[PDB]
Design an enzyme around this catalytic site. Structure first.
Site, PDB file in Angstrom:
ATOM      1  N   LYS A 158     -34.499  10.667  61.311  1.00  0.00           N
ATOM      2  CA  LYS A 158     -35.953  10.840  61.499  1.00  0.00           C
ATOM      3  C   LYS A 158     -36.632   9.494  61.825  1.00  0.00           C
ATOM      4  O   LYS A 158     -37.817   9.460  61.791  1.00  0.00           O
ATOM      5  CB  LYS A 158     -36.533  11.547  60.285  1.00  0.00           C
ATOM      6  CG  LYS A 158     -36.697  13.042  60.289  1.00  0.00           C
ATOM      7  CD  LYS A 158     -36.886  13.458  58.876  1.00  0.00           C
ATOM      8  CE  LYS A 158     -37.016  14.946  58.708  1.00  0.00           C
ATOM      9  NZ  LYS A 158     -36.611  15.683  59.922  1.00  0.00           N
TER      10      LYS A 158
HETATM   11  C1  LIG Z   1     -39.817  19.742  58.672  1.00  0.00           C
HETATM   12  C2  LIG Z   1     -39.278  19.093  57.393  1.00  0.00           C
HETATM   13  C3  LIG Z   1     -37.967  18.881  57.168  1.00  0.00           C
HETATM   14  C4  LIG Z   1     -36.662  19.220  57.992  1.00  0.00           C
HETATM   15  C5  LIG Z   1     -35.701  19.256  56.784  1.00  0.00           C
HETATM   16  C6  LIG Z   1     -35.568  20.422  56.021  1.00  0.00           C
HETATM   17  C7  LIG Z   1     -36.282  21.723  56.414  1.00  0.00           C
HETATM   18  C8  LIG Z   1     -34.746  20.421  54.896  1.00  0.00           C
HETATM   19  O1  LIG Z   1     -34.620  21.598  54.153  1.00  0.00           O
HETATM   20  C9  LIG Z   1     -34.059  19.231  54.519  1.00  0.00           C
HETATM   21  C10 LIG Z   1     -33.222  19.181  53.378  1.00  0.00           C
HETATM   22  C11 LIG Z   1     -32.555  18.005  53.029  1.00  0.00           C
HETATM   23  C12 LIG Z   1     -32.713  16.847  53.779  1.00  0.00           C
HETATM   24  C13 LIG Z   1     -33.540  16.900  54.887  1.00  0.00           C
HETATM   25  C14 LIG Z   1     -34.209  18.105  55.242  1.00  0.00           C
HETATM   26  C15 LIG Z   1     -35.037  18.108  56.384  1.00  0.00           C
HETATM   27  O2  LIG Z   1     -35.124  16.918  57.074  1.00  0.00           O
HETATM   28  C16 LIG Z   1     -40.270  18.620  56.282  1.00  0.00           C
HETATM   29  C17 LIG Z   1     -41.770  18.684  56.650  1.00  0.00           C
HETATM   30  C18 LIG Z   1     -42.664  19.589  55.745  1.00  0.00           C
HETATM   31  C19 LIG Z   1     -42.665  19.232  54.262  1.00  0.00           C
HETATM   32  C20 LIG Z   1     -42.781  20.505  53.460  1.00  0.00           C
HETATM   33  C21 LIG Z   1     -43.838  18.326  53.882  1.00  0.00           C
HETATM   34  C22 LIG Z   1     -43.579  17.682  52.498  1.00  0.00           C
HETATM   35  C23 LIG Z   1     -44.826  17.064  51.831  1.00  0.00           C
HETATM   36  C24 LIG Z   1     -44.565  15.574  51.569  1.00  0.00           C
HETATM   37  C25 LIG Z   1     -43.139  15.425  51.094  1.00  0.00           C
HETATM   38  C26 LIG Z   1     -45.536  14.983  50.529  1.00  0.00           C
HETATM   39  C27 LIG Z   1     -46.129  16.063  49.578  1.00  0.00           C
HETATM   40  C28 LIG Z   1     -46.109  15.664  48.073  1.00  0.00           C
HETATM   41  C29 LIG Z   1     -47.194  16.404  47.255  1.00  0.00           C
HETATM   42  C30 LIG Z   1     -46.641  16.990  45.956  1.00  0.00           C
HETATM   43  C31 LIG Z   1     -48.359  15.457  46.952  1.00  0.00           C
END
Ligand SMILES: C/C(=C\Cc1c(C)c(O)c2ccccc2c1O)CCC[C@H](C)CCC[C@H](C)CCCC(C)C
Ligand SMILES: CCCCCCCC/C=C/CCCCCCCC(=O)OC[C@H](COP(=O)(O)OCCN)OC(=O)CCCCCCC/C=C/CCCCCCCC
Ligand SMILES: CCCCCCCC/C=C\CCCCCCCC(=O)OC[C@H](COP(=O)(O)OCCN)OC(=O)CCCCCCC/C=C/CCCCCCCC
Ligand SMILES: CCCCCCCC/C=C\CCCCCCCC(=O)OC[C@H](COP(=O)(O)OCCN)OC(=O)CCCCCCC/C=C/CCCCCCCC
Ligand SMILES: CC(C)CCC[C@@H](C)[C@H]1CC[C@H]2[C@@H]3CC=C4C[C@@H](OC(=O)CCC(=O)O)CC[C@]4(C)[C@H]3CC[C@]12C
Ligand SMILES: *[C@@H]1O[C@H](CO)[C@@H](O[C@@H]2O[C@H](CO)[C@@H](O)[C@H](O)[C@H]2NC(C)=O)[C@H](O)[C@H]1NC(C)=O
Ligand SMILES: *[C@@H]1O[C@H](CO)[C@@H](O[C@@H]2O[C@H](CO)[C@@H](O)[C@H](O)[C@H]2NC(C)=O)[C@H](O)[C@H]1NC(C)=O
Ligand SMILES: CC(C)CCC[C@@H](C)[C@H]1CC[C@H]2[C@@H]3CC=C4C[C@@H](O)CC[C@]4(C)[C@H]3CC[C@]12C
Ligand SMILES: *[C@@H]1O[C@H](CO)[C@@H](O)[C@H](O)[C@H]1NC(C)=O
Lengths: 674, 42
Positions: free
Chosen positions: A187
């Site tokens: 990433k």
């Molecule tokens: C599109 C996204 C990830 C792709 C992905 C996925 C789906 C996985 O399953 C993975 C599992 C293991 C390693 C890598 C993975 C991976 O690369 C995240 C983008 C959306 C996400 C939900 C946003 C998260 C919010 C951030 C972390 C901060 C929020 C914290 C609050 C509690 C304040």
């Protein structure tokens, strides 16, 4: 010895081979490993009928179908459908035995072998979580995961509460850390950092809390992209260290809970949730069952001191000076080191296998590059040339394929071309000559060709270790145009649509304009093109900034005449739909006026009435949707079981008759409760 | 027949995808004849 408490070992333990071997075989409590084994086996049991394809086996592997497959090795072929059902039955039995801890090693092998055979049977079904399941099964094959919470301890109490070597946990933690860290490093790409990969995700209602203090673009950039990258880069470090384990646990729990609802990835998120507690103390389940009320402490197995085992060596200052490292200990340490080295190397070994290198590096599935790239296909044209007469013909895109992934890779395209050359003689075509014309866009960007449309792929040279000559390069010098493209797209009405195209020099584009698009035009943005009208045989040249109107129901040709790639765009509006909508709207108002005083309206109003019934569903309590979900899952499970029973009876006894099979299959599709 | 298109329909240019998410298998060419040859008149 602050280091000794920070990482659990000392620097003197990694100074000699004997000291390293002794350290990596230290006894440990196997409770956490047993709980992880139980959960992974249960998840695999539930995942076999859904994602592996047991419920669609009779559709995928029908015995007399004309189909092109894409195996990793062309010598690998599928079995008849009955033997495929037998393979799936053996895999299910292995998964169940792995879950229960009964005949652990044999069950592990019985799950592992057919699973990897099926995985290698089809390259178009490869992804990262299936590869992870295979790796986890291979790792668990060599571990002592049946020393606790298993039925091998209720049948022979000598493998009960026995310790395990240290590297059992070390390999698993290394695998999890590698997945997290390599995903984070992947990433670190310009498309993810700038916020192009996932720009529609933040509009989901699960992100509404974050939009109270931020705009939509800031929510898309700061939270989805930068936050995800930071979490990926820091998850392993947060989970490893004791001082920050709880905070990292909360972060990963929230991340995986949100991902289980944002996407449809099968069982990956639950597997990650179950793998997270592998970073805690190896005796945490004992403390958990200790913290329960004493009223529920007399039925569980008694909690006693774990017994010694031979799988791990014991080094003491008083209890014997030490023992020579046996073959098993050195083998385990070598396995740990070599496996971790191979797992680090493999996602970055694309410089050796150059024949799988398209616009993106390598085959998809084993590099942890999840959701970084998105593709959009605009047009696919396949044309053959008869080798006996010379007629030109056109094939339907994907006649004998069961997937669409072949449009992105040269090896898959070569396999498909060979399939077509073999299969077309059955359709009165002699020695076909096959050409492909595929236009793709990646993370916006202009549409362009990925392969050379002037090359006969049947005789085209492909090699696993050579760079492919007929793959077109990605035009990465036109990326800064994306903001202007977005501005042009938003600067339009709600009836007009636009298509952006970039073409290499020396190539042309033949296009048939449909009769439903009376108002269509082409505008040049860069380079210079020559536009030809086929009916009138007229050549007119367009310079940067000027536009042209095109006729409907006719052919036209666009030649790129500049020494550099040229970019233009198509602007069109579907005229028929305009009249249809503007008469239906008048008819609705006429109906309202007749109240105050047509099959098309029938269909449209029925569709909106069922969409308003979906609005009622929104008003309907979630328990109804939960009931529907449970009923659908029960249907797929029951159908898979009945089909497997039919095939196994056919194998063991023989095929009874066509009518009896028809009745059995009719019963198998009964839809229990609808 | 069902494996061939016209030149007009093949030239119509004006007519996203992630590879991590995981069904018209019954719309294969000649599917029904083979299904009835294997399973009877179902
Ligand atoms: C599109 C996204 C990830 C792709 C992905 C996925 C789906 C996985 O399953 C993975 C599992 C293991 C390693 C890598 C993975 C991976 O690369 C995240 C983008 C959306 C996400 C939900 C946003 C998260 C919010 C951030 C972390 C901060 C929020 C914290 C609050 C509690 C304040
Ligand atoms: C120092 C060498 C690397 C060891 C880990 C350094 C930690 C710093 C950042 C890494 C975060 C996690 C790394 C991945 C986890 C695997 C290592 C592991 O689990 O070790 C823990 C474990 C102690 O655990 P507990 O007693 O529970 O203490 C826990 C502390 N509360 O320690 C060990 O088992 C010792 C491991 C010795 C090294 C073997 C593992 C690392 C192998 C390197 C991978 C590359 C292969 C060979 C490299 C060739 C060049 C060296
Ligand atoms: C009459 C039946 C006879 C036998 C009865 C036994 C079975 C009944 C009891 C078990 C219930 C589970 C079996 C049936 C569940 C059916 C639902 C199901 O699997 O659906 C999959 C569903 C996803 O649905 P999709 O279809 O992808 O979403 C819709 C978009 N396509 O997946 C799930 O919901 C998974 C549910 C199982 C979760 C259980 C495991 C969770 C583990 C996480 C715990 C975290 C920490 C653990 C700590 C310890 C770690 C060492
Ligand atoms: C072998 C099981 C490994 C499971 C894979 C999991 C992920 C591993 C990462 C690598 C993924 C793909 C790279 C594999 C390299 C080898 C590929 C190979 O030999 O077969 C390709 C190719 C078939 O081409 P298709 O496109 O089907 O035919 C086109 C015409 N219809 O096969 C051939 O050309 C014939 C044999 C080629 C040489 C044989 C191998 C000799 C050299 C050995 C090294 C190669 C493998 C090393 C394994 C790496 C460890 C993971
Ligand atoms: C009286 C006549 C009509 C008999 C019809 C009975 C069917 C409704 C039965 C026969 C086979 C049964 C299935 C046999 C095996 C399983 C596996 C079982 O697998 C599990 O997931 C349980 C273990 C776990 O939770 O991991 C779930 C129930 C299910 C689908 C059963 C559901 C009900 C079925 C389809
Ligand atoms: C063909 O479509 C284009 C775009 O929809 C039309 O151009 C628009 O014309 C209106 C005038 O009524 C302007 O307000 C818009 O700004 C124009 N948009 C663009 C993108 O140029 C064009 O008028 C249509 N042609 C016909 C004959 O209807
Ligand atoms: C319109 O111009 C294009 C080129 O801009 C002409 O296309 C060429 O036609 C010749 C004759 O067959 C080919 O040898 C070339 O390969 C074509 N392309 C190029 C880039 O030269 C086209 O023939 C012209 N049309 C008319 C009616 O003159
Ligand atoms: C004969 C049929 C039924 C079973 C075939 C099993 C063989 C081909 C399977 C069993 C275990 C598998 C290995 C398990 C683990 C890894 C590590 C990974 O990083 C690359 C692939 C690799 C090396 C696999 C390659 C294929 C493999 C060797
Ligand atoms: C225009 O709309 C009609 C129906 O309103 C549809 O059949 C037709 O395919 C559309 N035009 C194009 C080019 O898709």
């Amino acid at each position: 010895s602050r280091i000794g408490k920070l990482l659990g070992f000392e620097w003197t333990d990694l100074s000699s081979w004997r000291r390293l071997v002794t350290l990596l075989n230290r006894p440990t409590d196997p409770a956490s490993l047993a709980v992880f084994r139980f959960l992974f086996g249960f998840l695999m049991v539930l995942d076999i009928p859904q994602e592996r394809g047991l419920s669609s086996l009779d559709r995928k592997y029908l015995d007399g179908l004309d189909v092109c497959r894409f195996p990793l090795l062309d010598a690998l072929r599928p079995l008849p459908l009955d033997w495929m059902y037998l393979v799936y039955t053996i895999m299910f039995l292995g998964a169940l035995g792995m879950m229960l801890g009964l005949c652990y090693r044999i069950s592990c092998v019985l799950f592992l072998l057919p699973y990897w055979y099926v995985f290698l049977l089809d390259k178009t079904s490869w992804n990262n979580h299936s590869y992870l399941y295979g790796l986890l099964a291979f790792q668990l094959t060599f571990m002592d995961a049946n020393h606790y919470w298993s039925v091998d301890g209720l049948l022979n109490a000598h493998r009960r509460n026995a310790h395990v070597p240290l590297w059992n946990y070390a390999v698993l933690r290394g695998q999890i850390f590698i997945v997290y860290f390599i995903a984070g490093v992947k990433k670190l790409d310009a498309d993810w950092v700038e916020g192009y990969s996932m720009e529609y995700l933040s509009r989901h209602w699960l992100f509404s809390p974050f939009k109270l203090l931020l705009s939509e673009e800031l929510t898309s950039l700061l939270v989805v992209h930068w936050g995800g990258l930071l979490l990926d880069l820091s998850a392993g470090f947060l989970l490893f260290f004791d001082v920050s384990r709880s905070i990292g646990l909360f972060f990963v729990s929230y991340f995986h809970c949100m991902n289980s609802q944002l996407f449809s990835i099968g069982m990956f998120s639950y597997v990650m949730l179950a793998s997270s507690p592998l970073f805690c103390s190896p005796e945490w389940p004992r403390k958990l069952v200790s913290y329960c009320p004493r009223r529920l402490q007399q039925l569980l197995p008694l909690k006693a001191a774990p017994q010694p085992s031979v799988s791990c060596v014991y080094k003491r200052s008083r209890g014997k000076s030490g023992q020579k490292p046996g073959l098993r200990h050195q083998l385990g340490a070598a396995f740990t080191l070599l496996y971790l080295l191979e797992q680090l190397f493999l996602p970055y070994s694309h410089f050796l296998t150059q024949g799988y290198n398209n616009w993106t590096n390598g085959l998809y599935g084993y590099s942890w590059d999840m959701m970084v790239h998105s593709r959009s296909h605009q047009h696919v044209k396949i044309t053959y040339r008869d080798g006996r007469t010379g007629e030109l013909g056109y094939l339907n895109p994907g006649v004998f394929t069961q997937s669409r992934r072949w449009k992105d890779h040269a090896d898959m395209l070569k396999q498909y071309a060979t399939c077509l050359s073999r299969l077309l003689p059955k359709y009165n075509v002699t020695e076909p000559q096959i050409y492909f014309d595929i236009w793709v866009s990646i993370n916006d960007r202009f549409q362009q060709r990925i392969f050379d449309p002037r090359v006969d792929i049947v005789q085209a040279a492909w090699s696993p270790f050579q760079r492919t000559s007929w793959v077109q390069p990605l035009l990465m010098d036109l990326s800064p145009w994306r903001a202007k493209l977005q501005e042009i797209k938003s600067s339009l009405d709600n009836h007009t649509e636009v298509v952006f195209i970039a073409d290499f020099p020396g190539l042309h584009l033949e296009n048939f304009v449909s009769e439903d698009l009376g108002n269509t035009s082409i505008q040049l943005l860069q380079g210079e093109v020559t536009v030809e009208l086929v009916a009138e045989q007229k050549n007119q040249t367009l310079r940067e900034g000027e536009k042209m109107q095109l006729p409907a129901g006719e052919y036209h040709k666009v030649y790129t005449t500049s020494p550099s790639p040229s970019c233009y765009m198509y602007v069109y509006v579907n005229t028929t739909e305009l009249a249809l909508e503007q008469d239906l709207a008048y008819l609705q108002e006429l109906k309202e006026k007749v109240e105050n005083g047509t099959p098309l309206v029938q269909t449209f109003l029925r569709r909106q009435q069922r969409l308003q019934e979906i609005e009622r569903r929104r008003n309907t309590p979630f328990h109804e949707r939960f009931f529907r979900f449970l009923l659908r899952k029960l249907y797929v499970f029951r159908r898979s079981f009945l089909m497997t029973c039919i095939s196994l009876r056919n194998l063991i006894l023989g095929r009874p008759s066509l009518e009896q099979l028809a009745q059995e299959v009719t019963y198998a599709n009964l839809r229990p409760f609808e | 027949g069902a494996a061939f298109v016209s030149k007009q329909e093949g030239s119509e240019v004006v007519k996203p995808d992630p590879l991590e998410p995981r069904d018209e298998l019954a719309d294969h060419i000649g599917f029904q004849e083979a299904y009835r040859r294997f399973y009877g008149p179902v």
